[PDB]
Write a protein that binds this ligand. Sequence first.
Ligand SMILES: OC[C@H]1O[C@@H](O)[C@H](O)[C@@H](O)[C@@H]1O
Ligand SMILES: OC[C@H]1O[C@@H](O)[C@H](O)[C@@H](O)[C@@H]1O
Ligand SMILES: OC[C@H]1O[C@@H](O)[C@H](O)[C@@H](O)[C@@H]1O
Ligand SMILES: OC[C@H]1O[C@@H](O)[C@H](O)[C@@H](O)[C@@H]1O
Ligand SMILES: [Mg+2]
Ligand SMILES: [Mg+2]
Ligand SMILES: [Mg+2]
Ligand SMILES: [Mg+2]
Ligand SMILES: [Mn+2]
Ligand SMILES: [Mn+2]
Ligand SMILES: [Mn+2]
Ligand SMILES: [Mn+2]
Lengths: 385, 385, 385, 385
Amino acid sequence: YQPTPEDRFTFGLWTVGWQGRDPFGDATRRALDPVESVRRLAELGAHGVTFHDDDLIPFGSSDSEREEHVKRFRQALDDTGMKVPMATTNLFTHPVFKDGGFTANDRDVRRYALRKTIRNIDLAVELGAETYVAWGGREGAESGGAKDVRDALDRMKEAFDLLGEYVTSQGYDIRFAIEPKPNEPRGDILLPTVGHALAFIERLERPELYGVNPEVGHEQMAGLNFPHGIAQALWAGKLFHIDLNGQNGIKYDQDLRFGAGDLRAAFWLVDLLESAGYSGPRHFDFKPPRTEDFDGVWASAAGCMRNYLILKERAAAFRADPEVQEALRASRLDELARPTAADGLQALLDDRSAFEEFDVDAAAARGMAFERLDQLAMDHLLGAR
Amino acid sequence: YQPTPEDRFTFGLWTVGWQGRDPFGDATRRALDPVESVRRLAELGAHGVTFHDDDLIPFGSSDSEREEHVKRFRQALDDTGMKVPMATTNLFTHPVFKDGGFTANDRDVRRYALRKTIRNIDLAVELGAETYVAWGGREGAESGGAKDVRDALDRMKEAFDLLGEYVTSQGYDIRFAIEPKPNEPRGDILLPTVGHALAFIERLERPELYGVNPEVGHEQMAGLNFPHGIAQALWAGKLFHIDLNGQNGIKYDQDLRFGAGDLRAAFWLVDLLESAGYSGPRHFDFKPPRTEDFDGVWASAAGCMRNYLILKERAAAFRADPEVQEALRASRLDELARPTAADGLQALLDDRSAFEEFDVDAAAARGMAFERLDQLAMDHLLGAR
Amino acid sequence: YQPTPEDRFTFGLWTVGWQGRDPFGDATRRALDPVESVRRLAELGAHGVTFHDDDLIPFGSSDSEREEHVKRFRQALDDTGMKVPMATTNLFTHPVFKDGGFTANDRDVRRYALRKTIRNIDLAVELGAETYVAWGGREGAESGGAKDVRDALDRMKEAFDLLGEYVTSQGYDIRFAIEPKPNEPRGDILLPTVGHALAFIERLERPELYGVNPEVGHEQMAGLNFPHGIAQALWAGKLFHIDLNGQNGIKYDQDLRFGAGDLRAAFWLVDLLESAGYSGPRHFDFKPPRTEDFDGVWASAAGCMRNYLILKERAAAFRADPEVQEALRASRLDELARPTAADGLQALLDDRSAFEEFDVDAAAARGMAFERLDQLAMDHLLGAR
Amino acid sequence: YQPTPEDRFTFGLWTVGWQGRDPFGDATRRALDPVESVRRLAELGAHGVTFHDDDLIPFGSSDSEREEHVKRFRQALDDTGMKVPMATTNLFTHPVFKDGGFTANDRDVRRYALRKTIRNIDLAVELGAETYVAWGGREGAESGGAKDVRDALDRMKEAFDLLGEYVTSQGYDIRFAIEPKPNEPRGDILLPTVGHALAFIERLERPELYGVNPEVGHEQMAGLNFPHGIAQALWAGKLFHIDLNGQNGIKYDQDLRFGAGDLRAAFWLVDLLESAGYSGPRHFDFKPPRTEDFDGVWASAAGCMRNYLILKERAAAFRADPEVQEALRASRLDELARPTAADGLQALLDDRSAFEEFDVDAAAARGMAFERLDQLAMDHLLGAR
Ligand SMILES: OC[C@H]1O[C@@H](O)[C@H](O)[C@@H](O)[C@@H]1O
Ligand SMILES: OC[C@H]1O[C@@H](O)[C@H](O)[C@@H](O)[C@@H]1O
Ligand SMILES: OC[C@H]1O[C@@H](O)[C@H](O)[C@@H](O)[C@@H]1O
Ligand SMILES: OC[C@H]1O[C@@H](O)[C@H](O)[C@@H](O)[C@@H]1O
Ligand SMILES: [Mg+2]
Ligand SMILES: [Mg+2]
Ligand SMILES: [Mg+2]
Ligand SMILES: [Mg+2]
Ligand SMILES: [Mn+2]
Ligand SMILES: [Mn+2]
Ligand SMILES: [Mn+2]
Ligand SMILES: [Mn+2]
């Protein structure tokens, strides 16, 4: 289960670089030079890294410092062959963003947030990024009167439309991916789930430029089924990017390494991504627990990749097993993929076998055989057949 | 705080008619004649009732029985002046729907579910309903292999498109409202939230025919902010109907009377509905607890209406208070409603006060004053100023 | 992974016998004769069955009917070799228990609940049960004024003390196990968790007669760590019985087959039970989903046993692996088992290496190596080393 | 609703002193001199403040600095009349505590944690504290193998027994209160709820020295009913202290001002505390949101006190209302307070009206009238009768 770059595994600079500061604790690890992270991740078999503007260039840097930080970063990519498929803006750390970025009540902050993002889009395009992610972690509220949500969605649409106008006017190929999160650090965050983000996108001026970057832990933070939400994003044609990690149910954002947390949901996610032929980066947005030293950071990163590859093998064995293929037919998954009424409405209305002469009790008595199917899946996941 | 029919309060036959059967207990109350519910609700000041097909006509009824049930029902509406603004199909009680209705794996069940709905749409139009609600309570799964969600969404789109084709071919004015629910009775239910339903609707053949019927308890069952989700539905122009009740956080669907559960969220919901000028029915989808006798059923129904009216008065006093209007300006809610960059992208890019000369520390040091605003709201809710 | 009776796997009559009625649906399966369940479970390798009084003898039965039901049941145990290690009272289904049994506000109901339990304790002793379980599923409330909780705990202590007085006066060996549940069917249930039940027991007249019967899904329904709670019950010497099943986080009580739901927590539970040498029944309190027919019921029951045995093998391989034993030392699990200050308080107060000369930064810089340990556990669970 | 010191309102130095650093954001406010907090809180009507050792004396301070910090603090208490009823140890911020304090796997860290606490107990006694709080925020784990919970509970019992041995050997009157929390910053925290802490205390060498310091938000973080848990703590005689704040369901620890979050649960909490005659400090453990400036900090603190006083008035009006007293009798709250079987077990066994001649259907048909009672409570809370 050794990763190679063709597996497309990517890591944020902020993941292995996390110093371990949490709400109740100081840092447990020194800061990492982005150059060293690139080298250490390449040695593990990663394909690429991603960054926030302020991860790569310290906030407030001068032009000459900015140029030296990028030049050092570019040399580490050249030395390793690592790519930069995705980038994003930090619109959450600085105190100026305390009431939001694009939806801050203060107009001058909203304008500043847009300028900060536009500057980093240029940098991301230069480094080769195909996707620009927006995480509105500060867009939201802790109380009901502090944010008019219809007004905030107006401001959010304006911000995204202007960013779409900007990349069009430069002839950039980059697309945007919205990363939903239901809460934390705000009491409730706007566009809290995959669904809310997909619905918002359909009201933008150029919807085709925008998709979702769903994160395993963020949907599980709302108790939602992450493979189900990914399926709806695939159905809509909007899975531009994905964040992989682990999460133990409804609580603070844990960002455990992928495969920790809900192991079965991870299996069904990997099964769906491979079956659907998702071709984007397999991006890990995780935090090595602050109990770990620097050797534990890299063990945690390696674990993400390994667990993905183990699940990929087991899911593929599951789908290829003729006994599973037989069980899927017994459970009528083939019938689910058949059109309900390709004969059309009138034919359905006149079809007496659909109502007047439908034997509802005979239909009701037919078991679905889902438990035998699910136990075959569990045996395949555990390597027990 | 006495309701009148112009307040547009509506109740499902299945709410005050609930016999008190739960997963662990037998019925604690006798069944109610729909006629008596209409009379008792009218006496309380309700505007109308809603129904499932099988609430009004017992499942399996003959044509002559069906006609007598409707004739009795119609006479109770005539005697009281009560309206029927909304109707829906029971696609969840009969064992034939155990794997779903529109997305059942068995094609013959999906066709039957469509025919059952189409039959009731006719009845609902005859009784005057403006909205037909779809609650896919059985569309979902308890295990990952039992439902391919992309296939199920294909079947769901087909079902809704055919229903839209049907009402168009009859020249009906009725529109559809999807009622989301994240789980129960299925382990996870498809279109689990307001957002997922809004996103799905945008892929239907005629999206303008479909909106959402969000329920307070269903979004709170996912830990989501119900006023926020209602705001996004209003923003999208899709709040066709609403279900009001109470719910104590993330657990089984409690269906408490409106105002119980999260009292502050109820206040902010009523504030939003009145401020936005929502003109649909104020529909209560609640269950009088099975501890109650028939007198407790009607006290519970009266409580729903009363609590709405109390919250309506307090929210209106909050918005009209000049000290609150002053606090809203101090918190820059006026600036949130102003366009971020009506001067356009180029002007924003050249505006040095948006970036090069933006004093980020002065902006960051400005408090939002949200706590004083929120305490004014709490004083208004409690009648303590 | 074939179970045998020496594995001590037990099932409630109400589990495989569940007809599939849920809050929104009618039964999908016919009722089962308890005799047939005993035979079918024995054929699967089960050790025993458990029952509610009303599972074995239909409520309201005459003495002659009661005797024939028991005689038939006893013959099925004799024919199979199955045991009856545990029994319990149904104090939740009949409408008389709608406000509780032992803590019903109506005193005459509380007295009836006690008499109903005492009658079944006699029957359980006759059938050989070692444990009598109390599940106060109706003890609780949906609103704050309806139950004074200090008064209710007074009544609950009185009920349990009287039951302890009863079994002592008959010279019975049977002990009581309280089964906690945080909510459902009541809005909140008294003694909601393992901890609350353990604390309550310490106030009973004869605490040694009472322990806990924790259920996987019930603690996960509160977002709690079930292996952690089992550990505290073992630490207190109170794990008299256990209910095994699966549950997907915070939502209604799913009662999935064991191993479904949180697979990793199931692994750590089995590891703890085997390491601690728990010698009680491995009891499954699960519901075959109502999508299943009778063949799916037995496949689901077999899956419970199989998954336990797979996890038992993987946990044992994990603990016996010398590389894991090395990682546990690296993570200082050996030091955790050493007394903190066996030298005593004064020696600790005078030990300068505990404070004045403790190198806090050197200690802080030592990584715990938990991630490498946890990835070894994951590799062992998945069969990937 | 103006607080006075006889209302016993207390605040942690760390509450109004919180600089606004969260997992995703830098500080939004400057640090506060503890002296200024004492003065500002006294001016608001507070009775007292509480502290962590490291709140009052910066970590690593020399003896002469330590003495000057305390002397300044003591003068602010003398100038204001403020008391210090409670103190606690910071065993969570420094990286040395990253795997816990009393239950850290490293023995030398456990010994250091004990010495750090013992030093602060001396200081707390000098300042007059009656309660010493233990919050084991780092005692726990993110993975299953990293902590043997039976071993950790052994170490926790040893730590608490040694602290009890220490205060006894000095003749101190101070008692200990354990503050439970289910998760955050650890994935799961040991003794996660009021119940688990009460059960643990009963295994300590001198149980009478230890009680609980429950926090509104911490039990709600597990979806539990906080008034119910407080009632069980009162029933056990262990409510030594309480932390008041607000929390919106199951998510990260919000620490909103008291009264925000679940308003009805706050009402029932205040009703219970006043009815039970709780005489300890009404301590607020809250964080003014980081959107606020220093004026918003004090408005937030004032709001805590005001909301408590409003709820106190409404709860008292509720209990004194003769129509409520009539409804409580109708709902048989009087019968709940009556002993179930003061006639004894034998008399119960021979009482034919408890079983043989109990009319179960007549009992079942009697409604509890809980909804009318609960609507009276809601009318009293809202000032709407
Ligand atoms: O892409 C933006 C990223 O910013 C991070 O700091 C957030 O915590 C992530 O959830 C997000 O993926
Ligand atoms: O509109 C359909 C209705 O069916 C009911 O039985 C469900 O429980 C409701 O949530 C829903 O509103
Ligand atoms: O032991 C009593 C049993 O009664 C069942 O019907 C409950 O649902 C179980 O959780 C419990 O184990
Ligand atoms: O008493 C100890 C205190 O430490 C704080 O920093 C925790 O966040 C509180 O929950 C706790 O009350
Ligand atoms: Mg992310
Ligand atoms: Mg509804
Ligand atoms: Mg159970
Ligand atoms: Mg606290
Ligand atoms: Mn995250
Ligand atoms: Mn509902
Ligand atoms: Mn259960
Ligand atoms: Mn807290």
